[PDB]
Design a protein around this ligand. Structure first.
Ligand code: HEM
Ligand code: HEM
Ligand SMILES: *[C@@H]1O[C@H](CO)[C@@H](O[C@@H]2O[C@H](CO)[C@@H](O)[C@H](O)[C@H]2NC(C)=O)[C@H](O)[C@H]1NC(C)=O
Ligand SMILES: *[C@@H]1O[C@H](CO)[C@@H](O[C@@H]2O[C@H](CO)[C@@H](O)[C@H](O)[C@H]2NC(C)=O)[C@H](O)[C@H]1NC(C)=O
Ligand SMILES: COc1ccc2c(c1)c(CC(=O)O)c(C)n2C(=O)c1ccc(I)cc1
Ligand SMILES: COc1ccc2c(c1)c(CC(=O)O)c(C)n2C(=O)c1ccc(I)cc1
Ligand SMILES: *[C@@H]1O[C@H](CO)[C@@H](O)[C@H](O)[C@H]1NC(C)=O
Ligand SMILES: *[C@@H]1O[C@H](CO)[C@@H](O)[C@H](O)[C@H]1NC(C)=O
Ligand SMILES: *[C@@H]1O[C@H](CO)[C@@H](O)[C@H](O)[C@H]1NC(C)=O
Ligand SMILES: *[C@@H]1O[C@H](CO)[C@@H](O)[C@H](O)[C@H]1NC(C)=O
Lengths: 551, 551
């Protein structure tokens, strides 16, 4: 049997096969020696024997508001954050390593950008069981597993105060670096860019950007409806969109991310940003009468990536954490560090991120309470209500907890079924292996993963071994931290990928982080002071309650 | 007039335009302050007031063989080299900055890999003269300039001992990262990869690699002629090659770099490497009976990139330098440094590298002395003579000096004409600006550039200003160092680009520099001990005189 199915090599050592029955662990620079990379170095030993658990830290960071307030006002705020940035990032390899096709380093992996990368090679196709050595020869029926432990029975709202404004923000921003090529199969992405390139606004390819572009003042095309600015129609900007058969071009808004037409929340955010891009164009032209379309356009886009990167950080990543420590977005905290300004979307990440539980049972817009069947392909709700109305609405309605179990609405429960299935095609390694990869202790029993006995008992008879518990389920069934939206794994695997992904954009490099990159101090400050409220309000007649937190 | 035409901003500060008549220099992190980035910081001041000229250093490194011998045996060899690596590299920006289309940072520049990048933005299209502010409104006729100062009158052999073996090696290796898209125009490359990806062996695209591949044991296809292994025929591997009309497929060797069929030297090296790739496949399979085609193939290619990177360094870059200091290729000297494992071929580099003077007057193969007209599209010379014969020949025949003037053979003198012309389309800045970019003092007169009065006097009446002397001519007409192949500029602009280009390949990163990346200690050592002699000799029945130095 393939010796590597035993996952012999610890601490990131690489299991290389040799001969017909041998294997060797490459423990290069792992901090351990030995046949399985298990004997630590004196420093490695200390470093780990002194690492306070995730739980202990997430305690501190969510406690002592008073003590934090002070720290937040001292330099220690940068000091910490920096550490977060560095430490958090080491967990993610760069340049990238494996892909659906190669469980080894290779020029093709490194250069063929159509593949999502992956942190742990697949479960060798020649192992006894699907997960390697443990568990059953057959894995739990995805469908069943989904109805038993993920089907929302009673809506559990997210304790932290997260609302649909954040929910939809989550979706939007993620679908700019998550874009699986249905034509190529799992493992393949259409979002070459692998990151915050804002391609969900400008298009994932030149042709499409040129379609969406006004080619005047750096402006993006658009249309006026009710005296308000909205994305142009597919008639004006003949771009490919995914609208159900039967809808005319004149009723479809062209936007960049073909999929965005199937949900007002999505098309709401697409409108705020289009508005914002054209707004910045004006600020620029005023300053640089000499510039042309391209430069106004290119510089506009760099300012928006910056805006996006900031909010995504100080307002978006702040909400999730639950932390008191003011997360600062400052590319300079990394200038002294050894960091690689490069990123590549991992498949392990496309899954981890699949937060479908967040969606509510119905969508309340004032006295009106719309059903999924009334929300889903509603070409009229946005123009009808207008930005402000929806922004206030989503900002007020709570979104559901993400971790815990049984909280995904039946309407989209199929998506979770597909996720689990794709996971298997991708041949992802077991959840417990992931725990270790990201520096955590693997679970010893189902009752420790879930904080109980009922589900644990059944997961046990389904999986057989805790060491056979799959990634996604293990991510959504594990116990939540105190009054959290989710827990440990999500937060200890989910952050690295999600931080290295941001601070690794080329604009955060010393080479690009210059006022001139943004057209001068004005563009630069736009970036430096971006904010959710400013983003909405500077682009709307009135300024509604706008937050990632429910009032 | 465009204020930026005056190249106002010093020390890499960025000239941003404002209003109709203003401009601002972005001196961010330049080490200088002031409206033009001219007032240094105390440290910057010291750092430069104490920098011994290029000339003084190139003196030391080419002198004191005895003192060097010792140093070379101490740790100081690494110590220095490391410094070379770091220092040399800072000169080159990463991530990349401008391109033919954008004289500003931009997402498109950063992501559209079809463009060659450039270190200095173009000469604004709205400047008084072609070079900005100085010189004449009309530039010297390329053709004339070429016949007057570059046309080889009497063959000047390269003083250092460089031979055609090195010459052809130079060509081969460079045409893997220099591959201008004739269909797209100047500024565009077909070599996405921008570096040592060995695509001149495997193809610049998947389709073509699959054509060249045996799909057995990781082997590359091939054919036996005279009991010897040679690249397959276009009949066997239906791949696109550039052979003159009238030559049948059965007489064309398919190789990866379409252009390689027009010169035995080129097809000589293509044969040595094909041989080498298949040789390593065997070493691998033996070790890993369990592996398949892909993995043998992928791992083979990583071993060859490594081989290539080493020889290119310790034998190739050693020859050019002329240095006594043993250049060590060790990716680890950089593990402590802040380095970006990323590269992008600059247009400024495609030019700089255009060493056509190297080609001799005739090609001597034993008693036989072939003319260009007998060498150029000679489909039979390689199979006729075989690897060894040619390798001995080229290793024995000296190549001509590269710097100095009037040493390019008439047969290819057109290429220099085109270079100068392309330079102008690309709107490259003046040579003197380049001097400064790469930390050198700009020339004050033509007589200082050339080491004399005759050519200097005429270049002067042609250009008008030394500050209008173009890049390429300035690179090939400047005075050579003592008994050198070329001088200062070439060596102070030509190395950075050429070092950062190597040490920046992903395999040099801590992430990939592991014995497992190469299939174990065996592949790893193959890399670690690669050598020109081993490369040829382990792939030939007999081992001829093989060197980059003439006997
Ligand atoms: C109205 C509620 C929502 C619906 C209708 C929905 C539906 C879907 C569907 C259809 C898939 C693709 C897999 C398949 O079923 O074939 C998917 C993928 C995705 N969704 Fe949602 N989703 C919703 C909200 C969100 C939210 C709030 C997030 C959080 C960011 C999210 C994250 C994802 C991710 C990460 C993907 C993977 C993208 C890719 O594979 O390219 N979705 N969603
Ligand atoms: C038999 C002698 C040689 C011939 C026939 C030759 C010819 C050419 C020609 C035709 C061009 C393209 C520009 C044009 O004229 O349209 C060129 C480009 C090139 N050659 Fe050579 N060359 C020779 C040797 C070499 C050598 C020894 C080097 C040194 C590496 C070299 C370096 C270059 C470079 C850098 C390019 C640019 C590649 C690109 O634009 O994609 N060539 N050469
Ligand atoms: C990136 O890798 C994918 C997968 O190898 C390549 O796609 C396949 O390429 C081969 C040869 O062109 C075809 O036979 C397959 O049908 C292709 N598609 C799929 C979905 O496998 C793709 O060509 C590579 N892209 C680049 C730019 O190298
Ligand atoms: C990279 O940039 C080049 C130049 O912009 C793009 O090529 C041009 O693209 C437009 C739109 O497709 C065409 O009208 C031109 O004819 C294209 N060719 C040239 C030579 O200009 C190219 O499409 C870009 N590539 C990517 C992958 O973005
Ligand atoms: C320390 O608490 C947290 C909590 C959440 C955090 C982080 C830290 C960090 C980094 C940091 O700021 O620590 C990021 C990137 N997070 C995310 O937003 C995230 C993204 C995707 C997924 I799925 C899960 C979480
Ligand atoms: C110090 O002397 C030298 C002389 C030549 C050197 C170098 C150093 C370095 C780096 C280093 O080893 O210093 C490289 C990369 N060189 C080149 O081979 C080179 C490449 C292209 C061109 I056009 C010109 C030179
Ligand atoms: C290495 O791991 C294998 C597989 O778990 C195990 O059988 C072997 O005993 C281990 N060797 C050591 C020294 O831990
Ligand atoms: C779309 O939303 C509007 C509210 O703006 C509602 O009146 C309309 O009925 C919805 N359309 C569908 C098909 O549910
Ligand atoms: C800046 O450079 C411009 C153009 O060379 C020059 O006219 C001006 O005097 C300079 N200003 C200073 C303070 O050097
Ligand atoms: C090609 O080279 C051979 C020497 O191997 C020579 O005899 C032959 O004439 C050459 N062909 C041409 C067309 O010059």
């Amino acid at each position: 049997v393939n010796p590597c199915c035993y996952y012999p090599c610890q601490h990131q050592g690489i299991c290389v096969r040799f001969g017909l029955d041998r294997y060797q662990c490459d423990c290069t620079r792992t901090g351990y020696s030995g046949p399985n990379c298990t004997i630590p170095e004196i420093w490695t030993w200390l470093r780990t024997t002194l690492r306070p658990s995730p739980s202990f830290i997430h305690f501190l960071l969510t406690h002592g508001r008073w003590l934090w307030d002070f720290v937040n006002a001292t330099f220690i705020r940068d000091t910490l954050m920096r550490l977060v940035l560095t430490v958090r990032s080491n967990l993610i390899p760069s340049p990238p390593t494996y892909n659906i096709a190669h469980d080894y380093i290779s020029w093709e992996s490194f250069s063929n950008v159509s593949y999502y990368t992956r942190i742990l090679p697949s479960v060798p196709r020649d192992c006894p069981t699907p997960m390697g050595t443990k568990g059953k020869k057959q894995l739990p029926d995805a469908e069943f597993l989904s109805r038993r432990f993920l089907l929302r029975r009673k809506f559990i709202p997210d304790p932290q105060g997260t609302n649909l404004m954040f929910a939809f923000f989550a979706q939007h921003f993620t679908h700019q670096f998550f874009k699986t090529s249905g034509k190529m199969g799992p493992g393949f992405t259409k979002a070459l860019g692998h990151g915050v390139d804002l391609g969900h606004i400008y298009g994932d390819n030149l042709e499409r950007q040129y379609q969406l572009r006004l080619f005047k003042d750096g402006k993006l095309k658009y249309q006026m409806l009710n005296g308000e600015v909205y994305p142009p129609s597919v008639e004006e900007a003949p771009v490919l969109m995914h609208y159900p058969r039967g809808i005319p071009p004149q009723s479809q808004m062209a936007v960049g991310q073909e999929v965005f037409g199937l949900l007002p929340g999505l098309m709401l955010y697409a409108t705020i940003w289009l508005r914002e891009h054209n707004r910045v164009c004006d600020l620029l032209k005023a300053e640089h009468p000499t510039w042309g379309d391209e430069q106004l356009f290119q510089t506009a886009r760099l300012i928006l990536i910056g805006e996006t990167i900031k909010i995504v950080i100080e307002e978006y990543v702040q909400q999730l954490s639950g932390y008191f420590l003011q997360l600062k977005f400052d590319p300079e905290l990394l200038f002294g560090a050894q960091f690689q300004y490069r990123n590549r979307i991992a498949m392990e990440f496309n899954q981890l991120y699949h937060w479908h539980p967040l969606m509510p049972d119905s969508f309340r817009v004032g006295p009106q309470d719309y059903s999924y069947e009334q929300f889903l392909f509603n070409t009229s709700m946005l123009v009808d209500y207008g930005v402000e109305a929806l922004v206030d609405a989503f900002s007020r309605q709570p979104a559901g907890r993400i971790g815990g179990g049984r909280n995904i609405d039946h309407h989209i429960l199929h998506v979770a079924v597909d996720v689990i299935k794709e996971s298997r095609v991708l041949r992802l390694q077991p959840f417990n292996e992931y725990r270790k990869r990201f520096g955590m202790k693997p679970y010893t029993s189902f009752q420790e993963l879930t904080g109980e006995k009922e589900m644990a008992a059944e997961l046990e008879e389904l999986y057989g071994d805790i060491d056979a518990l799959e990634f996604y389920p293990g991510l959504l069934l594990e116990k939540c931290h105190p009054n959290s939206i989710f827990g440990e794994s999500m937060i200890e695997m989910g952050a690295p990928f999600s931080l290295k992904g941001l601070l690794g954009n080329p604009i955060c490099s010393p080479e690009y982080w210059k006022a001139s990159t943004f057209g001068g101090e004005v563009g630069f400050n736009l970036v430096k002071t971006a904010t959710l409220k400013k983003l909405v309000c500077l682009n709307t007649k009135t300024c509604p309650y706008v937050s990632f937190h429910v009032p």
